[PDB]
Design a protein around this motif. Structure first.
Motif, mmCIF file in Angstrom:
data_model
loop_
_atom_site.group_PDB
_atom_site.id
_atom_site.type_symbol
_atom_site.label_atom_id
_atom_site.label_comp_id
_atom_site.label_asym_id
_atom_site.label_seq_id
_atom_site.Cartn_x
_atom_site.Cartn_y
_atom_site.Cartn_z
ATOM 1 N N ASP A 184 0.840 -1.189 0.000
ATOM 2 C CA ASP A 184 0.000 0.000 0.000
ATOM 3 C C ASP A 184 0.885 1.253 0.000
ATOM 4 O O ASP A 184 2.042 1.221 0.430
ATOM 5 C CB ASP A 184 -0.905 0.004 1.231
ATOM 6 N N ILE A 185 0.367 2.346 -0.546
ATOM 7 C CA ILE A 185 1.118 3.588 -0.563
ATOM 8 C C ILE A 185 1.124 4.179 0.844
ATOM 9 O O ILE A 185 2.104 4.783 1.267
ATOM 10 C CB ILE A 185 0.522 4.580 -1.566
ATOM 11 N N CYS A 218 4.369 0.673 -1.591
ATOM 12 C CA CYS A 218 4.578 0.517 -3.009
ATOM 13 C C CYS A 218 3.527 1.208 -3.814
ATOM 14 O O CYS A 218 2.335 0.912 -3.698
ATOM 15 C CB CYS A 218 4.610 -0.951 -3.424
ATOM 16 N N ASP A 219 3.983 2.145 -4.630
ATOM 17 C CA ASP A 219 3.100 2.860 -5.511
ATOM 18 C C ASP A 219 3.038 1.909 -6.695
ATOM 19 O O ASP A 219 4.056 1.616 -7.322
ATOM 20 C CB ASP A 219 3.710 4.208 -5.915
ATOM 21 N N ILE A 220 1.858 1.353 -6.928
ATOM 22 C CA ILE A 220 1.665 0.444 -8.038
ATOM 23 C C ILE A 220 1.908 1.117 -9.391
ATOM 24 O O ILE A 220 2.134 0.436 -10.374
ATOM 25 C CB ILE A 220 0.248 -0.144 -8.031
ATOM 26 N N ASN A 229 -5.405 -5.792 -6.273
ATOM 27 C CA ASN A 229 -6.536 -5.036 -5.740
ATOM 28 C C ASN A 229 -6.502 -3.534 -6.005
ATOM 29 O O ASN A 229 -7.496 -2.943 -6.429
ATOM 30 C CB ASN A 229 -6.660 -5.293 -4.233
ATOM 31 N N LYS A 251 -11.207 -0.193 -16.785
ATOM 32 C CA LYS A 251 -11.652 -1.418 -16.165
ATOM 33 C C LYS A 251 -12.004 -2.467 -17.219
ATOM 34 O O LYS A 251 -11.789 -3.644 -17.018
ATOM 35 C CB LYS A 251 -12.846 -1.119 -15.280
ATOM 36 N N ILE A 293 -19.469 -1.681 -2.859
ATOM 37 C CA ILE A 293 -18.980 -2.190 -1.593
ATOM 38 C C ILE A 293 -18.922 -1.080 -0.573
ATOM 39 O O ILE A 293 -18.346 -0.025 -0.817
ATOM 40 C CB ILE A 293 -17.593 -2.850 -1.733
HETATM 41 N N1 LIG Z 1 -15.577 0.151 -3.005
HETATM 42 C C1 LIG Z 1 -16.340 -0.045 -4.105
HETATM 43 O O1 LIG Z 1 -17.565 0.164 -4.069
HETATM 44 C C2 LIG Z 1 -15.667 -0.562 -5.438
HETATM 45 C C3 LIG Z 1 -16.511 -0.856 -6.525
HETATM 46 C C4 LIG Z 1 -16.003 -1.348 -7.738
HETATM 47 C C5 LIG Z 1 -14.634 -1.567 -7.912
HETATM 48 N N2 LIG Z 1 -13.755 -1.287 -6.878
HETATM 49 C C6 LIG Z 1 -12.313 -1.545 -7.156
HETATM 50 O O2 LIG Z 1 -11.706 -2.251 -6.051
HETATM 51 C C7 LIG Z 1 -10.307 -1.896 -5.941
HETATM 52 C C8 LIG Z 1 -9.989 -1.427 -4.526
HETATM 53 O O3 LIG Z 1 -10.979 -0.449 -4.221
HETATM 54 P P1 LIG Z 1 -11.351 0.133 -2.756
HETATM 55 O O4 LIG Z 1 -12.791 0.518 -2.848
HETATM 56 O O5 LIG Z 1 -10.994 -0.768 -1.627
HETATM 57 O O6 LIG Z 1 -10.434 1.485 -2.690
HETATM 58 P P2 LIG Z 1 -9.769 2.488 -1.584
HETATM 59 O O7 LIG Z 1 -9.315 3.731 -2.265
HETATM 60 O O8 LIG Z 1 -10.662 2.584 -0.388
HETATM 61 O O9 LIG Z 1 -8.479 1.670 -1.097
HETATM 62 C C9 LIG Z 1 -7.373 1.505 -1.980
HETATM 63 C C10 LIG Z 1 -6.224 1.062 -1.096
HETATM 64 O O10 LIG Z 1 -5.088 1.114 -1.979
HETATM 65 C C11 LIG Z 1 -4.248 2.191 -1.570
HETATM 66 N N3 LIG Z 1 -3.672 2.765 -2.807
HETATM 67 C C12 LIG Z 1 -4.112 3.832 -3.524
HETATM 68 N N4 LIG Z 1 -3.290 4.119 -4.550
HETATM 69 C C13 LIG Z 1 -2.343 3.196 -4.434
HETATM 70 C C14 LIG Z 1 -1.235 3.111 -5.273
HETATM 71 N N5 LIG Z 1 -1.116 3.989 -6.270
HETATM 72 N N6 LIG Z 1 -0.336 2.119 -5.001
HETATM 73 C C15 LIG Z 1 -0.546 1.274 -3.969
HETATM 74 N N7 LIG Z 1 -1.620 1.360 -3.164
HETATM 75 C C16 LIG Z 1 -2.541 2.329 -3.371
HETATM 76 C C17 LIG Z 1 -5.100 3.092 -0.676
HETATM 77 O O11 LIG Z 1 -4.346 3.779 0.328
HETATM 78 C C18 LIG Z 1 -5.999 2.077 0.016
HETATM 79 O O12 LIG Z 1 -5.449 1.499 1.204
HETATM 80 C C19 LIG Z 1 -10.051 -0.822 -6.984
HETATM 81 O O13 LIG Z 1 -9.347 -1.367 -8.113
HETATM 82 C C20 LIG Z 1 -11.436 -0.305 -7.374
HETATM 83 O O14 LIG Z 1 -11.392 0.186 -8.737
HETATM 84 C C21 LIG Z 1 -14.279 -0.786 -5.651
#
Ligand SMILES: NC(=O)c1ccc[n+]([C@@H]2O[C@H](COP(=O)([O-])OP(=O)(O)OC[C@H]3O[C@@H](n4cnc5c(N)ncnc54)[C@H](O)[C@@H]3O)[C@@H](O)[C@H]2O)c1
Ligand SMILES: NC(=O)c1ccc[n+]([C@@H]2O[C@H](COP(=O)([O-])OP(=O)(O)OC[C@H]3O[C@@H](n4cnc5c(N)ncnc54)[C@H](O)[C@@H]3O)[C@@H](O)[C@H]2O)c1
Ligand SMILES: NC(=O)c1ccc[n+]([C@@H]2O[C@H](COP(=O)([O-])OP(=O)(O)OC[C@H]3O[C@@H](n4cnc5c(N)ncnc54)[C@H](O)[C@@H]3O)[C@@H](O)[C@H]2O)c1
Ligand SMILES: NC(=O)c1ccc[n+]([C@@H]2O[C@H](COP(=O)([O-])OP(=O)(O)OC[C@H]3O[C@@H](n4cnc5c(N)ncnc54)[C@H](O)[C@@H]3O)[C@@H](O)[C@H]2O)c1
Lengths: 253, 253, 253, 253
Positions: free
Chosen positions: C42-43, C67-69, C95, C163, C192
């Protein structure tokens, strides 16, 4: 380069199921106006007959035939009558069909019916004309399906399941018939303002449906007639197994 | 009723990417021949210019610009040139772009590049011409996508994913631009026998691709030009967000 | 017959991108609780580190890595660090990602970014781990996509297009990697209620979204964690190239 | 956090169609072994009874009913027997049904029949058990569909269209029954090596089907039983209207 005659049906003979009204009526007229002889089939003979004089008032040649698409006996009759009246069958546009939203606990009779209209008749009629088209070295089959075939919503179990069957049959029939050099395609109308909807629809209802259509307008039968002409014309000679959705880019609810 | 003028582009101004050869060249000639003034763009000015000459010989109006779609600067330069030469823009046919089979271990440079060719370029140019289309009251953007966008196979990671991105761009973009009377569609062509392959192909190789195509003949550039005309003609005014596949009902390996 | 151990990750080593919070956090914990060693990337390091002690409070073994993906340099680093900390890489659950609704005229920078997050990083990271998985005779890659990959709506051009690219890459990557005996699948979360949404969402907003979900409830991260476990477990050994939508049967708007 | 009980069906009562052999038999044994009481139905009572014996030997509870799914009377009779023997119904696994490659010129009797096997039967039984599931507070209906529902080919008109109907039934039915806490899903299995084919197959023939499957091994009945368990287990409580394909990422010819 552009060639207008490729966009016309000169010398073609077409059967148009359920063409006494609505989208079906426009396809018939638009086809005759592009040069093809037409058999206008419909259960409501008076309607079928109106369309026929209407085509003659334009100089096209149509013939009427009453035919319940759900009766195997009437389908073969339609076919024999068409090959007699027109001399051959080049195009089949399977327009008639339907069914509608229904509760999950509809009697089975209601369920079985959607299939008679949307799937079995369409399949039996193709079986009947296919031999004729193969005799002439080719032909085109076009079915009017629906967007229910791709959407999911409450009270759509039968209608949606049947239209889906028909769309997928198109994709596979394209293979069986391809050998006989027959193309098979379908079109999925959006909310077409057929004169019926046109009479009931309130300016408030319209807004509700058009709420999710990018090209903000209800469809007109012609829209579907234009798509059909293209798909049945020589310009679309390498196009088979496709379902073209004509719905302004969205869905009407 | 059949209306031949709806199937023509009289006084329409179209910009056409990668129009020096194959598919784009033919859409350029079919469009110009159907009444529209066209800008032929291409990374190969020699090719673009020859196509322009040939168009003028047929009595159509056309202009040539050497444009490399992978350049943001060159894309703006293309839009200005069209605004400058044609006066307005009603149709954008994003034909260029590409990429092909690549090893899973390809260099990221190669991977991203497929996105430059089919995604980023296409989107930006849309941004460039959108404002001009809306002031004319409407428009039609059309992309040449691919069957790889719907299929699955080995050695297609970049190529297929980018065409998939482009195809779903069409569906979503149709929403944004729908309020500005702009329609967006795309075409997924099969194995089209363009002048290049035409000599790289061997009658043996041909019987192989055609092995799973119902309408057993390779595609000709005209087939694609025919669908692009319809899809950009007023006759398909309520068709947006669609992706039409022209492959004779199958898949040419 | 049923065999609980087939539903567990005993002796497996997993990399979980963006696992410091949300859905990602649940996958990490749920995986460690099923027996696999985990690298929580995670970042936001503090977040990653919290998840790690939290896993140890349960007896699982996790390791943190910032790690910045989107940085190729950090991705290879993540990989080398994971193979050093865990000894091998069996599972990769991609993820992290995102992007969001945006206007059609967002700067290109905004557009290019969605791809860095949803497509390029995912692809570069697989390229990095694939060799490790192939060394051990197999592995599993799982990406979290989204429903935008299949829906169309206004202001979704970049997010939705990216996506979609990722979902289609899954279908094709399944072929390249299949030889190395690596399965590749994805999951498309619905709405979610990650702690973030959970804090903002008003009981009125909830009803509006749940308006089109048959199983009338918002999703919980666990729902996605359960799906991931199944797809990464041995019970799913012949399952590759799939995208599983977890959204109560409908879409949240 | 990982919860093994969510992956079990303790005290669940399941009805399973065509469970005398292959896929259905294994779902019966995996389900019963995962804690649920099962009714094994089949047009072959000998087969059903043997499976029941075998289940009891493993210490599970099961009952046998010879039921021909193509009979409306026999379907009601199956529901009553389950209500009678198990007391309630929580899971319906509609496994039986079928049809296969048929000539375009097949008799309509054969065509309609594929609908009897995969569509009408499946729907009716759903109607029968729905009322019982809702009074328990919920349920899960699961169908064994087919890859023919998504593919296109020659000699598949009936078989493929009916499986397509069934698959879209899942999507729509999920809406209707969603208000009664009933989840509906389906599984599209690839080439599964069931005891029959197991001896009809020749190592030669095998290298051919497997020619385009990334995970290069034919499917085993367990793979399907594994996904059905998950899809019917509380762990997939927010998964409805989905159709999961288990084919090793490809298509076995
Ligand atoms: N929550 C929803 O309703 C939802 C719906 C559809 C799809 N998604 C997908 O699920 C995945 C995760 O989503 P989420 O809702 O948990 O998001 P979020 O933003 O709440 O969490 C993302 C996590 O990744 C970290 N992060 C952000 N940029 C990063 C980077 N550049 N490098 C490494 N880590 C990084 C953030 O700090 C966080 O801990 C995403 O790919 C998103 O597109 C989520
Ligand atoms: N109008 C819409 O918005 C819409 C939308 C999606 C799909 N469709 C599809 O388009 C097709 C035609 O629809 P429409 O809206 O014009 O319908 P409609 O009911 O207005 O017209 C159907 C025509 O067929 C005739 N007909 C009815 N049953 C027949 C039968 N059993 N045998 C022969 N003819 C029969 C009717 O008399 C009428 O003239 C149908 O298959 C329908 O499912 C329509
Ligand atoms: N021909 C087929 O069988 C086929 C099949 C599927 C998809 N396509 C698609 O059709 C489009 C054209 O394919 P084709 O085989 O006809 O193409 P092509 O290779 O003949 O290219 C057409 C023209 O584009 C020009 N061009 C190439 N790169 C350019 C760039 N970077 N900027 C500007 N102009 C450039 C080329 O010089 C050529 O004159 C592509 O989008 C391709 O994906 C073609
Ligand atoms: N095995 C595969 O490779 C495969 C692939 C795709 C789809 N399927 C699907 O899985 C399901 C079962 O296929 P299979 O090959 O395992 O089946 P199968 O032929 O082994 O049939 C399974 C059981 O169903 C019973 N049965 C048959 N007709 C019945 C009827 N009319 N009423 C009640 N019981 C009946 C059979 O006697 C058998 O005991 C079908 O829905 C089929 O479409 C199987």
């Amino acid at each position: 380069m552009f060639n207008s005659d490729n966009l016309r049906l000169d010398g073609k003979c077409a059967i148009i199921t359920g063409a006494g009204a609505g989208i079906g009526k426009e396809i018939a007229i638009t086809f005759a106006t592009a040069g093809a002889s037409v058999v206008v089939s419909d259960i409501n003979a008076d309607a079928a007959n109106h369309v026929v004089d209407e085509i003659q008032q334009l100089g096209g040649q149509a013939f009427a035939c009453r035919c319940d698409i759900t009766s195997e006996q009437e389908l073969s009759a339609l076919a024999d009558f068409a090959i007699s009246k027109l001399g051959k069958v080049d195009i089949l546009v399977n327009n008639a069909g339907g069914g509608g939203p229904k509760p999950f606990d509809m009697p089975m009779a209601d369920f079985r019916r959607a299939y008679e209209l949307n799937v079995f008749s369409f399949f039996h009629l193709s079986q009947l004309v296919a031999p004729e088209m193969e005799k002439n070295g080719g032909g085109v089959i076009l079915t009017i399906t629906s967007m229910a075939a791709e959407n999911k919503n409450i009270n759509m179990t039968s209608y949606a399941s049947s239209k889906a069957a028909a769309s997928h049959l198109v994709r596979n029939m394209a293979f069986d018939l391809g050998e006989k050099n027959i193309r098979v395609n379908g079109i999925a109308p959006g909310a077409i303002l057929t004169d019926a909807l046109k009479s009931v629809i309130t300016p408030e209802i319209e807004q509700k449906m058009l709420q999710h259509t990018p090209i903000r307008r209800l469809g007109q039968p012609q829209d579907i007639a234009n798509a059909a002409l293209f798909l049945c014309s020589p310009a679309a000679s390498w196009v088979s197994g496709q379902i073209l959705t004509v719905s302004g880019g969205g869905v009407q609810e």
